[PDB]
Amino acid sequence: SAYVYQLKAVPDIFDEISQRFPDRVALIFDQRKITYRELAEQCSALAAVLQNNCLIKGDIVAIKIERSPELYIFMLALMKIGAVMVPVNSNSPERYIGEVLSAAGARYLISDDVTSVPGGAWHVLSSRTLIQNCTQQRSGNYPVLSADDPALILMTSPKSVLIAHRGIARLGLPVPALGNSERDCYLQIADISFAASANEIWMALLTGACLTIAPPGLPDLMALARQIESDNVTMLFLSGGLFRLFVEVSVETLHIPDCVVVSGDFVNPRLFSVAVQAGKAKIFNGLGCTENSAISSLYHIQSAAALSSESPVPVGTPLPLVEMVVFNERLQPCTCGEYGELFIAGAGVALGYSDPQLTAERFITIPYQGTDMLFYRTDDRATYDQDRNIVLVGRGNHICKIRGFRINIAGIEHLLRLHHAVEDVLIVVEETPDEPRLHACYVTQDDGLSVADLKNHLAMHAPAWMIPEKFSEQQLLSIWQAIIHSEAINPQENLLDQGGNSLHFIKLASMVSKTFNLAVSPADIFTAGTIAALAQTIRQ
């Protein structure tokens, strides 16, 4: 009877873990290996130091540290003293940092770069100063923490999500689908600002396994392959995009580990097929949900015969202490092939958003198995497989998943409207051969404005992953490309500033006048300035 037990908090699990496996490797960065004994000592020293700087239970403390051993020492230490973490991406722009810390209400900010952070109602603290201040015997005096106490805050579009201790402490339970243990090794490549990073960190540190730390910045697919082999990773978690990258460029890497878990967004089955055919490793499709703290369900693709373009790959069956139900409009569990909405419950469920009205919209208390149980209501349209696996079939909300980052369109539209040259912007999602792309249609009165201007504008206000990749005829451009011969050097973009010489413009005007029954002079060409203006005057 599961109601007779409850999870210990993350600090207590780590303390018992580090006593049961003290001589096991916990962290690897470059060639430096840190043991659980060594890591536990550093955690205890840093926790005492953090208490000296007036951090107490319940404080909202942000972390902005590059991927390094000190990042996880801070995570563990902040847990131990009962603070609430707000992880910030270290390459995030400081304007976005200001908005994040204000939405979270973070009163302290611990950073390895004090120059790259904004000022505000928070006290900024040097990571290096706090690490240097450690003493090698000081411990104790830490609060008793409950499983339901808050542990960290994550952001969704911004909405603040409050994660309980239990929501990540559940990753200290072995997952029967993975058969994971202390003998495994995890590669962390996900960013700490995302729930995905928990899958790598806490599944490692709370089972006695090893966590090998990828260097900061963008992933280097070949360095990651090199790193996976050198550090003998056995459990590999990947986003759909990065999984596709490995399949297309270095599929032989995907079978060095034992299990590969792809999660966060719909992936085309052919990529799974090539991966599954390519070797012995166990390939998984997983449901990950920020409001369920971390990875929630796994489906093991045993063979390519389970894959088809007729229907998407299942997300599988819940993790330990996770419960998932697909409900029809009458709050009945859907039968096989009946489409409904996916509800998630159990230990992983967040404590709620910062807005309690939105919390009531998305977190619902339902009597299930005869007991009042709280379900997070995902806006994912789903059904049950013939074998009671759960299959996601689509979406039904304004929150959209591009590259798995979960973006709200209206925020980027507004951020672009603040630019002096931009009058209004409309953003649309568009199909693309491999993954859907974000396409922004903008209107301006200024023509001396580059797409890079809008991109660099957003990059000071928002993360680089949030930028739309595309920003807002054929007969005219083809004619000019033949006149200058360089079909590829001259796009439909920009003015005619390369031009060539006089003769090129005369040739263009006469041929346009020949191909369109319209009188076009070089003066009309120079007054148009670009191909689009020529097309507009032609249709007029």
Add this chain to the structure above:
Amino acid sequence: AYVYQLKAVPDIFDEISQRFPDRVALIFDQRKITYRELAEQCSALAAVLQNNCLIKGDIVAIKIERSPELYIFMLALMKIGAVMVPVNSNSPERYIGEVLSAAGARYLISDDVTSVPGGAWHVLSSRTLIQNCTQQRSGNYPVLSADDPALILMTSPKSVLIAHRGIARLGLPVPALGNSERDCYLQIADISFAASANEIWMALLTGACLTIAPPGLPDLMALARQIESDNVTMLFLSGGLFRLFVEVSVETLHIPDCVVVSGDFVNPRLFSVAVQAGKAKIFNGLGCTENSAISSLYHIQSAAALSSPVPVGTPLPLVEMVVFNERLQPCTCGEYGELFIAGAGVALGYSDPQLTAERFITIPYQGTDMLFYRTDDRATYDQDRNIVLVGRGNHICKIRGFRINIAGIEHLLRLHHAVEDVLIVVEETPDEPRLHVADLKNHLAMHAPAWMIPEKFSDNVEQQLLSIWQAIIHSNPQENLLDQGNSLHFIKLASMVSKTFNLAVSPADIFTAGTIAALAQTIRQRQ
């Protein structure tokens, strides 16, 4: 032939307008002006110019847009014995100042007083002078000789002084063309160039009609409509514009009777396609600034007369052309030499007498001492004694026939505040040879005419890297966008480069390289 001499341009025009008074001399838009009307306006304006104390030998510059009034002023200035300095109306005023200084101009007549610089010259409004024309005419114009100066042209600037004979020779019918008063000429060349003489004076000094193309850039379709509307029979084209007509509207080239292409080498394939397309005679011609105007014509009678350069032919009336070997003997057929030009068209010299001695040389030819302008064209004789140009040398650069000075553009580009240094070269292109960021062009456009600006301002790894990214871009070459932040694409690109080569390339290496070309540079460097 030494017992008589050519009349001056005013006297030939007077004889023409007395013999053909009711013939159309000028056409602008729909406005037709007869020789009678043109003569009256010239006489009125000549009296006006004389009353303003312009006298024989005065250096008078004109900056007037293509219009009837432009040619009225040209004729009137000739009558009073002034020395013309035609200025391109699209020239920037800083270049206009340099031209007037090099010419020694004392006066400047313009239809736009605001577009010209001040200096040692008196500025006069064309329009005011036209209004000042009353009914009285002069009863005493200077006696002009064939050897009297008529106009000054520029080469790179050095001033070339043209005698009256040098353009008055165009009043003699050319036997190759069969021209007469019955013909019509399209004026489209700019007055700052000798080429415009071929159109202006061959019309006005033979009794023919001159149709005036509107100011600005040539509009190939507007020119086609105008050639058809005014039934042009003699069409003079630059090599570039001839090629443009052949490629776009070759049917226009056969509305006239003769088409004369001159100024630069033309691909024989263009002549062949032109000659096949209809009835008109296609000519290749030698034009030389120091010979005042068109100098020789070759009639390309069929496509069979062409092989993979077209001869420039035999001289015009009173022009003599000799190809000399190193010992000053006329070259035999197939013997290569240097082209020398003599006769009525030869210029009086440059403004500096040292260069005049360098390029104008007195040689005994068939027992007579004759003054030859010495070109730097390497040439030989055809088996039928047509002259064929085969190459070029020295400081003359043949970019679309403009005779560019490379050192001058280097200097003008070094003047920009972001100096650095410049080299500039000429490169072989499919079309005309090209001279090899827009701020630099807009800088030069303030110092020189737009035709003077260079058009370009600056191993399988490049092909491989381009195709590697084409796995993404097929959904452009080595510098269209440079570092264009879509993670996935940049990660895929760096890994595939590392996979297709044998070197560790990170996304940081891609971002620090900047583009496929710099990526290939580092790749070839790191190999």
